[PDB]
């Protein structure tokens, strides 16, 4: 199949293909949101939290409708932490997003070191409580998994303590699967893709990174993401990353090999990720 | 403080001064695209692949260390017959030219990963493992640089589990993050500062050390086409461009700056780095 045919597909057909070929697990932190907010909304009159939440919901809905089973979205990571508290509480208390979870049969989970890192206040305790109640409440949903990262950047010590307790309880060391279940709440084998933004970087999906995880970096802030963009990414992941057969270099004509060869010898300094800063902003070249 | 051209133009000593100052302290650099490189640059039946490859590996590691990078992490083998990989592995601990390299450039060499369990239980496999151990003892008096070779170093969860259980049993309490990193790698490093990849946008095999601050790069040409210029464009980007200050003040921008940004982000198709194209059976970013 070609790209245009994929783009032209009905949503249901696309979704069938994604449930078939993957990605089963997409990591998608919503990035560049401040820039987005300053370009698309009115900063002193519009509320940043609510505008952001609406965009988040639009995109999570788009991802789940395209057949992606699990989305991992880092929310907060290593100015006042109390400010982040409100935005967080929205994820468990906003009526529209609750309506969304129920309608799309989404199971919501939270991962990371938040219980210890969040402030020891009535407020922080309240958010943590919201998280537990939301994960319990949506646990009967079976169609999609949504995993919110809150201080979910480094799981080493968490995994150490979990493994120690596990050994004392069950008499033996936990498996990789059991470790992943202990950290995330449920099991998934790996991340199939990470959709990043701006400066080429990935973060906050511990235990799940692999050389098979397809990496993408949008130029525009995450909230500009359309169906067509998402589908170009999906098309690359499904049809282009594991393209077969592997190149038989020995079956190529001398002109083919020469084209490749002279290209690599002429510009051996072409590096994706090397950018340029203009007007205070980094742009990939 | 500097433009790209000025950086490219600096004497090696000055570049190394800057790198010791601003980082990267730790670069992850798997040598990738080596089959393509070898078929483009060499004559498959008449040139020896092991030594052509080894020669390039040494050139690049030497280049990296001379530019002031303290620690290089290089994934070697990662999840055809495993016995085939054994020879290439043994070269890293037995080839006289590379041992001479470790000596002249004062490199401490370490091996990480699940290799002791995953390598074949044969005289050959055990010989390779023992040579890894002995190389690490033999170079442990070198202090100027750290070189870490990954052999099945793709997934550290169960290794960390067992390590932590054992640690708690003996060394009295749960091991700290630092202690876990030391247990897995042999020594301590805070994080990876950059990853230099190739072709399809992907990273792999540096467990425990990935951060949102890890700068990501992907060369178009196979690793062995790397020159000083390539390396330095990478270094310039990492050092001067990724952490550029001040942060953009969108509210201080003219209507034209916002308009340009805005119409760039609104325009379709929008550039997604990582979405490639396959021509002649090969993926191109
Ligand atoms: Hg503002
Ligand atoms: Hg769905
Ligand atoms: Hg679930
Ligand atoms: Hg749950
Ligand atoms: Hg998850
Ligand atoms: Hg248990
Ligand atoms: Hg621009
Ligand atoms: Hg060949
Ligand atoms: Hg050096
Ligand atoms: Hg050392
Ligand atoms: Hg290391
Ligand atoms: Hg081409």
Q: Can you give the residue ranges of every domain in chain A?
A: 1-245
CA atoms of B123 and B127, how far apart (whole Å): 6
CA atoms of A259 and A261, how far apart (whole Å): 5
Residues A200 and B271 sit within 8 Å (Cβ to Cβ): no
Chain B residues with beta carbon closer than 8 angstroms to that of A160: 160-161, 163-164, 167, 174-175, 180
What is A1-245's CATH topology? Undecaprenyl pyrophosphate synthetase (3.40.1180)
CA atoms of A219 and B140, how far apart (whole Å): 45
| Residue B49: Cβ within 10 Å count | 14
Q: Return the DSSP state at B46.
A: T
Strand partners, A278: A281
A280 CB burial (10 A radius; 0-12, 13-18, 19+): middle
Resolution of the determined structure in angstroms stands at 2.3
* Structure tokens that stand for A176 in this block: 């990789």
The contacts of residue A277 (CB under 8 Å, 6+ apart) are: A283, B241, B244
- Name the residue facing A160 among B180, B236, B282 (closest C-beta): B180
Contact A200 B208 (CB under 8 A): no
Q: Return the DSSP state at B280.
A: T
The contacts of residue A53 (CB under 8 Å, 6+ apart) are: A87, A90, A94, A96, A97
Distance of CA A152 to the CA centre of its chain: 12
CA atoms of A200 and A32, how far apart (whole Å): 13
CA atoms of A152 and B34, how far apart (whole Å): 35
CA atoms of B202 and A122, how far apart (whole Å): 42
Which residue of B272, B277, B283 to mutate against A (max A Cβ within 10 Å)? B272
CA atoms of B64 and B113, how far apart (whole Å): 23
CA atoms of A86 and B264, how far apart (whole Å): 32
Residues B52 and B38 sit within 8 Å (Cβ to Cβ): yes
A250 to A245, B19, B39, B84, B220: CA distances (angstroms): 13, 41, 8, 20, 21
Three-class secondary structure assignment of B244-272: CCCCCCHHHCCHHHHHHHHHHHHCCCCCE
B165 to A166, A173, A199, A261, B217: CA distances (angstroms): 9, 8, 38, 51, 36
- Closest ligand to C-alpha of residue A70 is 5
Chain B residues with beta carbon closer than 8 angstroms to that of A211: 78, 154, 202-205
CA atoms of A104 and A101, how far apart (whole Å): 6
Distance of CA A206 to the CA centre of its chain: 12
CA atoms of A135 and A129, how far apart (whole Å): 10
Method: X-ray
Q: How far is the CA of A88 from the centre of ligand 11 (A)?
A: 36
CA atoms of A216 and B210, how far apart (whole Å): 17
* Share of chain B residues as helix, strand and coil, in percent rounded to the nearest 5: 50, 15, 35
Residue A147, phi then psi, degrees to nearest 5: -125, 115
Residue B267, phi then psi, degrees to nearest 5: -75, 140
Chain B residues with beta carbon closer than 8 angstroms to that of A184: none
Whether the link from the prior residue into B169 is cis, omega within 30° of 0, is: no
| Residue B89: Cβ within 10 Å count | 23
- The minimum CA-CA distance between B121 and chain A, rounded to whole Å, is 23
Strand partners, A217: A196, B273
Contact A229 B270 (CB under 8 A): yes
CATH number belonging to domain B1-246: 3.40.1180.10
Rounded to a whole number, what is the distance in angstroms from the first to the last CA of chain A? 30
Residue A104, phi then psi, degrees to nearest 5: -100, 5
CA atoms of A196 and A29, how far apart (whole Å): 7
Residue B278, phi then psi, degrees to nearest 5: -105, 120
- DSSP count for chain B of H helices, then E strands: 12, 9
- DSSP H or E run through A245: none
Over the range B178-212, which residues count as b (16 or more CB within 10 Å of their CB) and which as e? ebbbebbbbeebebbbbbbbbbbbbbbbbbbbbbb
Chain B residues with beta carbon closer than 8 angstroms to that of A245: 281
Distance of CA B166 to the CA centre of its chain: 30
* Share of chain A residues as helix, strand and coil, in percent rounded to the nearest 5: 50, 15, 35
B269, B274, B273: which is closest to A224 by C-alpha?
B269
Contact B177 A163 (CB under 8 A): no
Active-site positions of B read 32, 36, 49, 81
Q: How far is the CA of B13 from the centre of ligand 9 (A)?
A: 10
Strands A193-197 and A25-27: parallel
Per DSSP, the three-state class of A248 is: coil
- Using the Cα atoms of residue A264, residue A269, residue A274 and residue A279 in order, give the sign of their dihedral: negative
């Amino acid at each position: 199949v070609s790209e245009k045919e994929f783009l032209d597909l009905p949503l249901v057909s696309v979704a069938e293909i994604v449930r078939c070929r993957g990605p089963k697990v997409s990591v998608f932190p919503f990035d560049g949101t401040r820039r987005w907010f300053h370009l698309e909304c009115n900063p002193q009159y519009d509320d940043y939290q609510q505008a952001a939440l609406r965009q988040s919901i639009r995109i999570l809905k788009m991802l789940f409708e395209h057949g992606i089973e699990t989305v991992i979205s880092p929310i907060f990571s290593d100015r006042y932490i109390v400010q982040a508290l409100e935005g967080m509480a929205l994820l468990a208390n906003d009526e529209e997003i609750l309506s969304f979870y129920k309608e799309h049969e989404v199971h919501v989970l939270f991962y990371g070191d938040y219980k210890k890192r969040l402030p020891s206040t009535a407020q922080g305790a309240a958010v943590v409580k919201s998280f537990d109640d939301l994960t319990i409440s949506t646990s009967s949903n079976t169609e999609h998994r949504l995993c919110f990262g809150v201080f979910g950047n480094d799981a080493a010590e968490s995994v150490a303590q979990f493994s120690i307790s596990w050994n004392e309880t069950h008499g033996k060391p936990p498996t990789r699967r059991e470790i992943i279940e202990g950290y995330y709440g449920e099991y998934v084998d790996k991340a199939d893709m990470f959709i990043g933004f701006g400066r080429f970087s990935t973060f906050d999906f511990p235990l799940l990174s692999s050389g098979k995880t397809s990496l993408y970096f949008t130029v525009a802030p995450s909230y500009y993401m359309t169906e067509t963009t998402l589908r170009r990414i999906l098309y690359d992941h499904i049809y282009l990353r594991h393209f077969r057969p592997k190149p038989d270099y020995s079956a190529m004509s001398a002109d083919q090999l020469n084209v490749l060869r002279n290209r690599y010898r002429a510009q051996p300094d072409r590096v994706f990720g090397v950018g340029c800063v203009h007007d205070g902003i980094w742009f990939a070249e």
